[PDB]
C-alpha cells in the first residue's frame, strides 16, 4: 500500500532506515510519490563508517589488477542493465529517454577511463562525495571508481531526493563480486553533509552542486582537514558572433538551454548576441515553442518537468523578479499546460532579453528552463563580460573566423572553451583524481 | 657612513628605493653588520607588479625554446660564478664554504633539470573524435608569480622557485629573506646578463609588509613560501583566502630512528652531521632521533662523535658546524636548551660553553645532545633551529613509530637499519611521505617534487618537478568542429 | 557429403564464393578433406576493396572509444568462443589441445595489449610558440590494409595483427592460410558479432595470385607478412615497388648454444619441449642448437629426452608433438633427413618410420635429432621447418656465436650459462637483436610489429601550422 | 696566384688530398673562382673509413654524459663564430647575410634539440632495452642548404654513439669545414668525425662500402632514389626526405596584401634555392585577380649580392642552373605558358658577371605542362588556376611527391577540410613554410634510425 521505503547498503547488506524522518520524494511529471528517502542517523552513519574502515584494509589489499577487473566487471553489468538504469532516471527525474541513455553512456565512459589506471598506480582511507540536491547527477559513475581502483573506501552522499538511481547502482556493484562493505550510500540533509564533514577520518570530499554549498563544504573541509576538489557548475556564457550557422546554432542554443529541463550543470543559460546577432531572436523562440513538452517516458520529450514544485515555485519567481526589473519576457513557461500532465512541475520554454549584470537574474543560478541573452559591440567586451563573471565553469563560442576564435580561447581566463559546440566536456575525477585519491 | 645596501630589481635594472626603515645585516661569525636592506613601500611594489605584468605577454608569446636557452646561459653563468656565491653565502648566511658549494651545485642541479622541459610543455590534441569533431589541450602559464624565501638558503629556495617559473612562461616576483639579499642579488644579475628580457624578473626586498601585499594583491596567481610553521600557515591563510594557490614547505623536525642492527659507525657520524650541519640552520635537518635497543646504549659513542665536531669560522678549516645567523636565535637556541635541561632532558653535551677563537663575539654554538627526551620536553614541542640534537630512547619500535606520528612537523623521516623488513614496518605504520632508508635526511632529486606530509608541509602542489610545472601551468581543452551545414 | 566451401566475408555478408579453382583441406591426422577453400577472383577482390574503402571513413571519424569498446567484446567473445577456436585450430592445423589453448591465449593477451592504445593514440601540440602563431599534430590513419598470415598460427598472428589497424583507424582485408582458413572465418564471425561497422573487414582466399593482387593494387597502404624467408622477401620487394609499407618476420632461423656451465636437465627438456614443440612447426623454431663443451657428451640425454615425445595426435591424450601441416611437408622433411644422412650427418634419433596407432595416414614425423653438422651441409643453410634438430659441435663460445652471425637471416637465439660475463659476451658479439638467457625460444613475439611500435606503424603524422594573426 | 685547396678531415686531422681531380669553386655573385675541392680518392676513403672504425668502440664506450657535454661545448662555440659561418655562407653559396644567419640559428636550434634528448638512448622475467649504437654512417649534402646538412646529422648520429662520414657539397665545403674544426675544437675524440669530398663516384663508393651502415641524403628526386636502391641493395639502412613542390593554396577571403607578401618571400626568397621552397601557388575563386599585384610585389624585390646591404635575394649557386632555368622557362613558353615577369636577363649593376636571376612568374600552367612536372629549384614560381577548393586538393594530390603545402584563408572550415583530405606531410595555414626544414620522412625518428634494439630476457634465479 505505503510507498517502498529505500533500504541503505551499509555493512555490505542492504538494511531498512530505523530513522523516524522520512522526506517524501515526488514524481515531478506528475507530482505523484513514488518513495520517501530517509536521513541518515548518527548510528547509522557510525555504523557505514565503521564498515568503510573495516573493508579499507581488505580493498586495499586487493591488488590493483584484481581492483581493475572488478571494475571490468562492474562495467559489464552496467551495460547489461543499462536500460533498467536509463528506466530508473526517467521515472526518478521525468528526465527524456535519450537524455538518460547519454547520461548512463558518459558514465560508462568516465568509469572505463578509470580503469585505464592500471600502470599509473597507495590509498587515504575512507572518501565521500556530496551530489547536488539538483537533478540526479550521474557523480557516482563519475568518482566512485576512481577512489576504488586507487584503493580507497567510498561513502557516496547521492541526491536524497532521486536515490534509486544510486541504489540500483549499489546492486549491481554488490554483484560484481567486490568485497562486501566497501561502498556504502547514506542519505540525509544538511545535518549528513555537516556529519561527514565534521568526520576526522574521511579524507576527501566531492561536490559539483551549488557555488554557495560547494565554498560552504570546502571551508568545512579544510578547517577539519580534508583535501576537496570542488567543481561547482556554475553559470555559462555563449558569445554568438553573426558569421556562424544560423540554424544550428539556434538548434545547440535551444537544446543545451533548455535540454532536460536545463537543470544540467553545463546548461547554457547565457548567451550573447553580439555583433547584430540580434536579429536570431525570433527563430530562437520559435525553435523553442517547437520543443515538446512532454513526460520524459513518453515520446517527444525535448525536455522534462523540474525535480520539485519547489523548484517550479523558484522558477516562478525568479521570472516575476526578471519581469518586474523591466526584463521582456519574449516566451513564457510559467503558464505551460501539458496535456495529461498538468499535476507536474513542467515549465515551459522561457526566454528573457535586455538581461544585463545589474539584473538579479545574471547574478542567480536559475538552473531550468530559462535562457537569458545580452548584447555587446564588440568580440572585447562579450570577453570582458564573460571575465567579469568570477562563477564560470565553461563557455563557448560560434563563429567561422579563425583568429576570432584563437583570441577568444586565449584571452578568456575560463578553463573549457568551445568553438561551435554548446556545451565542451559536459561531465562537470580525470587524470587529477589518482593524484586526489593518493598520496 | 653606510654600509653597503643591497639594491631593488625594477623593470630589469636595480635602483636604490626609498628607505624609510633599515635592517642591520650582521655577519654571522662576528655579529658585525656588514649590510642593510630597506623597506619597500608600495609604489615599488606596484611598480615591480607593473614591470612584471606588461613583461609577462613578451614572455608568454616567446618560444620555449629560447627561454630554456636562456635558463641554460644563466646556468653557464652560476656555474663560472659559483665561487662568488659561495663566498658570498658564506659570508652573510655563516654557512661553511663546502656547505654553499653544495647548496649552489644543488641550485645549478635544478636548473639544468628546468632546462629540459620541452617535452613535458607540450600538450595533447584528439583529432576526429567525431565527424568534423576535434579535441585540443593547451597548456598556459597562470600569469605573475611570487617566492619568499629563508636565510637557510639563500640559493637553493630561489634556484627552485624562480627559474621554473622563468622557463614555464610566467614573470616571478622574488622575495629574498631580509637577511641574506646578496646572493640573490647576485643571482639576479647573474640572470639578467644570461640573455632574459628586462621585466620579466623583478625584486622586492621587506621584512613583514612584502609578504602582506604578496598575498593581498589579486594580479599575483601563485606564491611559494619556505620557512617557519607560523610564517607559512600565515602566507598560506591569506593566499588561498585571497584567490591564489599557494605552496609552502614549512619548517621541518626529521626524527631519525637508529636499529640495533645497523653498523653504528657511518651511521653515527651521519646523524651527528645532519643535526649539527651548517648549525641546523635549515628547512629540514635531522635534528632529532629515536634510538631503540642497543641504540639506547650507543650513547656514549654519539657524544663522542658530537665531541669531534670542531665550531669555527664558515671561511676556515674544521669549521664542521657555524653560528648563528643572528644574536636572537643564539638567545632562543640557549633557552630552548635550558628549558630541556630543566624538564628533565638529560644533556650529555652542552653546547653552549662552546667558544670559537678569535670570533666570540659571534654567534657560535657547540654540538648539544640531549638525551631521555619524551614529549613533555619543549624541545620535542618546538623546533630549535640550532645545532641541537634531540634524542627520544623508546624500549620498542612501535613507541618510536607513534611518536614520530605524533610529531605535527614530520615533513621527513629516516630509519638506519640493514634489514629490510624492519624497514618495512616502520614505513608502513609511519605517517610521513618521504620515508628514507640508511640515509639521514630523504631529500628530493631535482627529477621529482618535493614529497610532504605533515604541518611542516602545506600546498595544492609540489614545488617543482612535474607537479612543478603542473602548478605553474594551466590545462586550457578546445573543442572545435569546423564542418559546414 | 559435399565438403561445404568456405565462404567468404564482404561487406556484412558471408558471401558465396564464386571462383571455379578450389583447393582442398585436407586433415594432417588421416589427410582426409574436410573442406573446400576458394581461390578469389578479381571480381571478389575488387568488392572487397571498395567495401573496405567505403567502410574507412566512417571507421576513421568514429571516436577512438567505440573501436576500444568493439575491440573489449570481441575479446570477451574469444574468451567465450576459447573452446570453439582451439577445436577448430586443433582439427585444421592438426596441432594439440594444449597448443591452440596457449595460441588463443596468447592472441587474447595481445587483443587486451592494443586495447590500451587510447592515450598512445593522442597528439601533442605546442601553443603559442610565436607571437598569434601556434604548432599541433595529428594522427590519422594510414587507410586500408592487408594482411598474410603463414599456415601456423591462423588465430594468434590475425589476432596480433588486424586489430591494431583497427584501433587505429585503418580498414583490414585479411588474407588467411590456405591450408587453415577455419578458424579466422570464426574469428571474423565472433568480430562481426561484437557489433562492429559492417564492411570494415574483409577476407579473400586464394593462391600465390592473392598475395599478387594485394601487393599490386594501389589502394593498399600497409601489408604485414609472416613465414619463410622466400616469400617474406618476395613480399617486402613488391611492396617496396608498388610503393606499399611491409613489416615482415623473415629471420626465422634460431640458434640454440649450451655451454657446460649450465643445468643440464632442465636445459635439455627446454630444448625438447622448443624444436619438437607441435612438430617444430613454427617459424620462430629452435630447430637448430650448438653444443659446446660438456654439451657433446650430454647430446645423448638430449635424445633419451626426444626419445619420451609421445607423437600422438592433437585430438587424442599425451600428443606432444602433431601431424605435419600436409603430406608434401613430410615428403619435403624426409628428403632433407635422407640429405643430412648422406652428407655424413649422423642421425642419432629418427621419426621418419614413426607409425601413429589409428593415424599412420596423417602425415605424423617423430623427433629426428641430426648430429655432426657443418656450415657446409644442406640441414643447417636450408629451413626444415619440422620436428628436426640440426646439432653442430664446437669447441668454445667464439666458434658458437661466428655460427650464428654466419646465418644473417637468423634473429633470433638464446644462451644457456651461468657466468654473467659469458652472457654479456654472447649478448654483445652475436648481431642478433632477440637474444634470451636460460630459455629455449627468447620472447616468441617477433618483431621487423605490435605496441607503440605497431601504432607508429598503422599511423602517420601531420605537422600543423598555424597563424590565425588576423 | 693559386687558389687555396679543400683540405679532408681524417683521424682528427685537416690531411691534404692527393687526388688530381679538382673542382672550381666559382663565386656565384662574380663566377670568380675562390676555392679548389678535391675528389677523394680509394685510398683517402679507405683511411677515413678505418679511422671512424677505430673510434667508433672508445666513443661508443663513453656514457651519453659525456656525449651530451661535448654536443654543448660545439653548440656553444657555433654560437661563438656564428658570424664566421654567416660570412662563408655569404661568400661560397652567395646567400645573403639575413638568411644565412637565420639559417645557422636554425641549425643551432637543431642541435640544442639533439641536446635536449634525455637517457632514451639507453632504454623472474628480468629484462633489458639496451639501444646499441650502429657503427659508421655517412651522409650526403644538397646545395640548398650545405651549412645546415652537418648540423642535422652530426649531433644526432654522435650522441647515439656512432661514427659519422660526411660528404659535404663540393660547391659548399667551407661551412661544413668550419663546423668540423668547431667540433674538433670542442673536445671530441679525434678519429669521431670524418669528411671526404667528391661525386657520384664517392655516392657509389660509400653506397657500396659495407662498413657504412646508415647514410642520409636530401635533395633532388633523381639523385634520392638512386641512393635508396644503391643501398637498400647492400642491405643498410637509408633516410632521405626527398625535396618536392610546395603548392601553396590562396583563397579569396585571405588577406590579400599579407598573403602576396608572404608567397613572393618564401617562392623567391634565396633565388628559390631551398628545398621547402614555395615554387607553385594556386589562386582559387577570385585570388586569379591577385595576377598584377602578385607580379608588382615580386618586381617590389631588390636584387643584390648576398654581401650587400638590402638584398633581399642572392644569385644562383652555378651558372649551370642558370642556364637550367632559363631553358625551363623558354620551354615553358613553348608550351603556351603565358608568362608575367621574366628576370632571366637581368643585369645587377656591379654584378653583371654573376648568376643573378630576376623574379619570375607564369601562370595558365597546367599538370602536364613540363613546368608543373619538372623542378625549377629557382626564382620561378608558377600559378595554377581553379574554381573550388576540390580542384586545388586534387592537384596537389597528383603531385608524386610534395613536403610542404599552404593554404592562405580565414575560414577555419575551409582549411580544415584542405588539412585534413591532402595528402600531404607537412600542413600550413597562413604560412608558407610550414615547417623550416623537412621533418616528414628528424628527432624521435632520428633517434630510432640512428640507433638499434637489443631485448635481452633471463630468468636466471635458479644460477
Redesign the interface.
Known sequence: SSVPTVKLFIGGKFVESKSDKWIDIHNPATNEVIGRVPQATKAEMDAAIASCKRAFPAWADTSVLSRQQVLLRYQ?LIKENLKEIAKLITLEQGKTLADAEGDVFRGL?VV?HAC?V?SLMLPLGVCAGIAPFNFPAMIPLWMFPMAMVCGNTFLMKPSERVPGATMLLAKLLQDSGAPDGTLNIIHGQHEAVNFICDHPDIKAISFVGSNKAGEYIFERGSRHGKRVQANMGAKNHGVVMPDA?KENTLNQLVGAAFGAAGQRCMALSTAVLVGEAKKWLPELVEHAKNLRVNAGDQPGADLGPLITPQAKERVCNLIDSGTKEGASILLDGRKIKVKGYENGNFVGPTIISNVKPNMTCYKEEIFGPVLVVLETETLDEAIQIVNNNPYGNGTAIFT????T??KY??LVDV???????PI??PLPYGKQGIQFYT?
Open positions: 559489464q565512459q572505463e585505464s592500471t550557422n567561422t573566423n579563425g583568429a576564435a584563437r580561447a586565449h578553463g573549457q572553451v568551445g568553438v561551435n559546440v565542451p566536456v598520496q
